[PDB]
Amino acid sequence: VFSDDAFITDWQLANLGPWEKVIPDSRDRNRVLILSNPTETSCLVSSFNVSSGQILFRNVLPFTIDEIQLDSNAMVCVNSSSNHWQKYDLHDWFLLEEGVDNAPSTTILPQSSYLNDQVSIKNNELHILDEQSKLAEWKLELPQGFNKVEYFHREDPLALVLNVNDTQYMGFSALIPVWQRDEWLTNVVDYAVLDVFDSSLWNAYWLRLTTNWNRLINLLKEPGRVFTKLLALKDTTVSDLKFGFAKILIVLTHDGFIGGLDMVNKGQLIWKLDLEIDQGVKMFWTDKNHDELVVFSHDGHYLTIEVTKDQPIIKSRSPLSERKTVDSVIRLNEHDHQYLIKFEDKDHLLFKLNPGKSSHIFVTEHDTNGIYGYIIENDTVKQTWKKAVNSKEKMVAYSKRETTNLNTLGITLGDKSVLYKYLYPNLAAYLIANEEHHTITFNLIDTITGEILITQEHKDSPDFRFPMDIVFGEYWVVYSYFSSEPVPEQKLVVVELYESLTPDERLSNSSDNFSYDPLTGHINKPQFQTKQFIFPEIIKTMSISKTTDDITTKAIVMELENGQITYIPKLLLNARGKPAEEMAKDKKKEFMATPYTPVIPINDNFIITHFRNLLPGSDSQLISIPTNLESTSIICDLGLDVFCTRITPSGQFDLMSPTFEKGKLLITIFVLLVITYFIRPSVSNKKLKSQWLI
Amino acid sequence: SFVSKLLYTVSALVLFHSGFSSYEFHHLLKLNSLNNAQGLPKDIMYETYAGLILFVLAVFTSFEKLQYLPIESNDGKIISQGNYLKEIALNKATNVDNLIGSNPNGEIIFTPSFVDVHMKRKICREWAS
Amino acid sequence: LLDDQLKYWVLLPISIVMVLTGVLKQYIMTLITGAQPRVKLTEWQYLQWAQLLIGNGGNLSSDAFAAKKEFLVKDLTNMASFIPQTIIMWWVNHFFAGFILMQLPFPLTAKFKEMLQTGIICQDLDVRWVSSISWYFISVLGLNPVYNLIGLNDQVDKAMHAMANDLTIIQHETCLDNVEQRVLKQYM
Ligand SMILES: [C][C][C][C][C][C][C][C]C(=O)O[C]([C]OC(=O)[C][C][C][C][C][C][C])[C]OP([O])(=O)O[C][C]N([C])([C])[C]
Ligand SMILES: *[C@@H]1O[C@H](CO)[C@@H](O)[C@H](O)[C@H]1NC(C)=O
Ligand SMILES: *[C@@H]1O[C@H](CO)[C@@H](O)[C@H](O)[C@H]1NC(C)=O
Ligand SMILES: *[C@@H]1O[C@H](CO)[C@@H](O)[C@H](O)[C@H]1NC(C)=O
């Protein structure tokens, strides 16, 4: 099922970042090693074919760039706090040596000095000079922008790299342009999705008849008649536009850069706008009309941008009321056009921008210290409660209840009894990691009032150095953490919430005229059932897929440490499961009751990113975009590498197939037609003329 | 073409036209709803019922009153009962038989083979031979 | 849901195949259809004559009832269901699997969701949305009018001697005596 659309639909882009150092390779002379993308803890060391694009490999090394130097080649990397050091081979990333006592040696990587040696630029034009007898061969007109000459090799495989604009690199050879690269997309912070789509009675009888009959007459000719009747014979662009597959993804990078990526056509760039905000923090649609964007900056400015089919225009820039650094922004009610802005130093500002050209409102903020909650009344914010952790506890994962279209009100059993799943909208789930007992606690807080309603602690020697995560479904919660005691393996835990566990009961949820009041606390309280599963590989992050109507299974989708992305349907993670010995001839169970199966093995069919490397960075997001053709949903991974693809958790049942056997069906119909047409005269003549004996 | 086949062809054309028009109208009530991000009845109905009534009158005007020719005589003299169906009471069935100059018992009455041989030997003698 | 122009290649071929296999079934049952001495057929004929004089001719023979009996006694003494429906279920489950074909206009109950939606592995889709096999489950029942309209159509001696002795005075029918009353009972 994969090999037809293996690389066709997958949408992977490679971003190397702005290059910091370019080291030549002693062997395979048209190859270099690029140190790029610095941060406080690591850097990105890649290998690059210099007479092409075609990044060869990438690795995130946990050393700062100033700690990475050559030998006295062999690329010695030495920590400074300790003396842990690693010597890695060039031309193959082999860990040649490792040690703790002493580094072998270092040499500081030399500065360019490309002036006075090979280059002179006078008349907005670049001349390459021999060292002596400077005859100035291979002159080239400069590009529009020009920052510096990144790399230059003078011997037989001549190659030249220019850092033309701030983020663009141009590569020439013996001079004709050979390749061009752009790393403006190195870190995506927030996204927004833009959709593209198509666009007395007797007089009605006459106009309809005339237009239909003329339409038939015009298409009457152009055998071609049978193929026009066939309706099988095609351009895929109208098919993709009809199902909503084609879309524009609007991304805000970590620096100030908005851009639109074509969700089909392998991510060609439709338009790019360069802001001057110096960091972007969030991005929103201003109104339901989906024409304007509001962009918040780190230093406190906000911008209003008009999105058009052509290159957009930055129609407004202005500061906030208080010029402080912005931590985060929450979108309030759509129609009132409000935003709650949390500044670092933890100060909250209500913001009412423009028209976009008791009815309490409740908010919830979370930190590593706890969950806080707020109430917005009379255009002012007021602290309402607090749930703060102790000195040795630290909250690690938190998730909210996503709004979901309600298709069925209860899960139905075999013998046709129904459990009436628990559907209360104002819930949040979070994990508290406690040292001094080595425990992980799960809490399901009621966010309007602040009741806990569930606590569930695990003591199986959790590690706390390996990533932890939680996701909240329609009526269930699934969280993941690493643990040592049963076996040292990644662990998933799923809890499912029901109104009452007796097979037919609405203990509460009186639905006739009650008009529940949640702020009093009168609501019904849940009951729950929980299970744990073991997974082989370390799960970096998790999400749940979306569709137009939330019918198909939710397909918990996971990004692993490798960068590989794998999903499993929620049907496999079944609470209320049994060990498959007690599932046999248990009439009460379900339709197609899945067994318990605690050990989950990895299935290579479901691994998306079949052969893609997909280094997704340390800070990444998994997002899901619904489409029409409800079997299919789009999933994208944003981060250092941006990637997009389509998944079908329940199989593809709306679109019939790309492998339908039409010819065999027509052959069967034609065989039946001719055998009838040939056997009819025989039976008619023989039996009718013999039975009457005329 | 008399009224029944005319009404069949007209009913078929009208029903196909109304079906295609309803196909078009109901296709662009979901596509147009999707184009707005999930946001011609009367004439079509009257045309559809007109097609239906045409079909029903085409099925009913396919019944013609029974009219006969006499077996004995040779003038037209159409012997019409003014009925649409055939009677179930044996009295009226044999009545409509007797108005024609035939007898349904047929062979038992005439005994065809014996009188056949006698008359075909006779037919050579008579004047028309 | 939003299904995409698979109505034609599923609804039309299935209906065509059911009509054509019905016609073939009728023709094959016609062709397949599902004593040699004269004495054998003669005795069968005399047996049938006794039967009809019991039932048929024992009504209006009022004077002749007595005379006959001496002469009488002196002279006397489901693959069609199983084959094609299984074949069609086999063909439908082979070619048309794992699809949603249409929604019925009337709401069924959930066990019909179990029966009809075998292709799909969802759990809350609907009862009204059906796979392709449902189109067969209706087309079996409702194809009778179409078939009508296209034109289609659908040891020994002792026993009868005992009944000959039984029928002597069993019933002498009151006919050719009351007939004047019944003629005067009508034609008024
Ligand atoms: C096999 C032929 C198909 C027959 C299916 C029945 C069609 C009639 C029908 O829809 O009635 C339904 C069938 O709801 C049920 O499914 C319960 C069945 C009740 C009839 C049982 C007969 C013993 C019940 O009537 P209702 O008023 O409670 O439903 C709401 C109104 N409605 C949306 C239906 C307009
Ligand atoms: C780099 O690209 C050039 C030209 O495309 C090619 O000849 C060379 O083999 C490439 N390097 C490697 C290691 O494949
Ligand atoms: C060197 O080791 C120390 C040990 O605590 C660590 O904190 C530091 O981050 C390491 N150096 C780098 C560059 O990561
Ligand atoms: C750098 O800026 C120039 C001028 O705006 C523009 O061509 C582009 O953004 C960059 N240069 C090139 C050659 O792409």
PDB file of N, CA, C and O and ligand atoms in Angstrom, chain A residues 28 30-31 49 51-52, ligand 2:
ATOM      1  N   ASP A  28      37.935  13.254  -0.748  1.00  0.00           N
ATOM      2  CA  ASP A  28      36.710  13.527  -1.494  1.00  0.00           C
ATOM      3  C   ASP A  28      36.469  15.035  -1.572  1.00  0.00           C
ATOM      4  O   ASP A  28      35.492  15.564  -1.042  1.00  0.00           O
ATOM      5  N   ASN A  30      35.431  17.551  -3.003  1.00  0.00           N
ATOM      6  CA  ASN A  30      34.155  18.260  -3.133  1.00  0.00           C
ATOM      7  C   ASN A  30      33.183  17.807  -2.041  1.00  0.00           C
ATOM      8  O   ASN A  30      32.100  17.285  -2.293  1.00  0.00           O
ATOM      9  N   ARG A  31      33.601  18.028  -0.797  1.00  0.00           N
ATOM     10  CA  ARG A  31      32.780  17.728   0.365  1.00  0.00           C
ATOM     11  C   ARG A  31      33.304  18.540   1.539  1.00  0.00           C
ATOM     12  O   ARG A  31      34.517  18.674   1.704  1.00  0.00           O
ATOM     13  N   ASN A  49      27.785  18.114   0.402  1.00  0.00           N
ATOM     14  CA  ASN A  49      28.410  18.078  -0.912  1.00  0.00           C
ATOM     15  C   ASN A  49      28.394  19.485  -1.488  1.00  0.00           C
ATOM     16  O   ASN A  49      27.323  20.074  -1.659  1.00  0.00           O
ATOM     17  N   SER A  51      29.476  20.783  -4.469  1.00  0.00           N
ATOM     18  CA  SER A  51      29.113  20.970  -5.867  1.00  0.00           C
ATOM     19  C   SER A  51      27.649  20.637  -6.138  1.00  0.00           C
ATOM     20  O   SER A  51      27.278  20.400  -7.292  1.00  0.00           O
ATOM     21  N   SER A  52      26.822  20.596  -5.102  1.00  0.00           N
ATOM     22  CA  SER A  52      25.401  20.306  -5.216  1.00  0.00           C
ATOM     23  C   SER A  52      24.727  20.860  -3.968  1.00  0.00           C
ATOM     24  O   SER A  52      25.313  21.657  -3.228  1.00  0.00           O
TER      25      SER A  52
HETATM   26  C1  LIG D   2      28.632  15.398  -5.024  1.00  0.00           C
HETATM   27  O1  LIG D   2      27.994  15.847  -6.215  1.00  0.00           O
HETATM   28  C2  LIG D   2      28.759  15.597  -7.403  1.00  0.00           C
HETATM   29  C3  LIG D   2      27.976  16.187  -8.551  1.00  0.00           C
HETATM   30  O2  LIG D   2      26.584  15.956  -8.394  1.00  0.00           O
HETATM   31  C4  LIG D   2      29.011  14.099  -7.565  1.00  0.00           C
HETATM   32  O3  LIG D   2      29.875  13.894  -8.677  1.00  0.00           O
HETATM   33  C5  LIG D   2      29.646  13.523  -6.307  1.00  0.00           C
HETATM   34  O4  LIG D   2      29.735  12.108  -6.410  1.00  0.00           O
HETATM   35  C6  LIG D   2      28.818  13.894  -5.084  1.00  0.00           C
HETATM   36  N1  LIG D   2      29.446  13.397  -3.870  1.00  0.00           N
HETATM   37  C7  LIG D   2      29.134  12.223  -3.313  1.00  0.00           C
HETATM   38  C8  LIG D   2      29.882  11.871  -2.066  1.00  0.00           C
HETATM   39  O5  LIG D   2      28.286  11.479  -3.793  1.00  0.00           O
END
